[PDB]
């Protein structure tokens, strides 16, 4: 019942990124230091590459939670610019007004 399949895929990526998150943190800790032996670091590199693709946190995009717009989205309200302006003009957003100075 999401807005579109693109939003549905993004939700799945977020869910699969929330999972395996600690495992990525633990493996990447091995990879991001020079104290550990290089052979162990390379094995950690192989393990983190073998991890599922969707678990990568950089595949998550902050889309609008109302129109699934991939860009023009304010992160504080998680709304696209058009939806944000529509609510602000109607007055349904507290403490938000036209800026004149």
């Amino acid at each position: 019942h999401y807005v579109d399949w693109r939003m549905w895929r993004d939700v799945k990526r977020r869910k699969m990124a929330y999972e395996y998150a600690d495992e990525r943190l633990r493996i990447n800790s091995l990879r991001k230091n020079t104290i550990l032996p290089k052979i162990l670091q390379d094995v950690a590199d192989e393990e983190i590459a073998a991890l599922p693709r969707d678990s990568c946190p950089v595949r998550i995009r902050n889309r609008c939670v109302m129109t699934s717009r991939p860009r023009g989205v304010k992160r504080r309200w998680r709304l696209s610019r058009i939806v944000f302006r529509h609510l602000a003009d109607h007055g349904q957003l507290s403490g938000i007004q036209r800026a004149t100075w």
Binding site: D22, R26, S29, L30, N33, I35, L36, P37, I39, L40, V43
Partner: protein, 79 residues
Amino acid sequence: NEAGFDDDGSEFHEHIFLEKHLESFPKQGPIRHFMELVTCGLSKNPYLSVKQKVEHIEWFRNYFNEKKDILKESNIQFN
């Protein structure tokens, strides 16, 4: 702002001083240096509980146990 939230009644020493969980880990070597960094990071972390902080240490111990053969190749002994 904290009512109804108790981290199992843990104290500051339990949250911070995690060196007691590194008894299995060797006290000398690069593995010790890496675990000192991990424990220092866990101690400074305010968003994690004692249970999960120990779980990270447990995972590193299990991973090093599995990869002991590589450590033997690199002239490192674990446990």
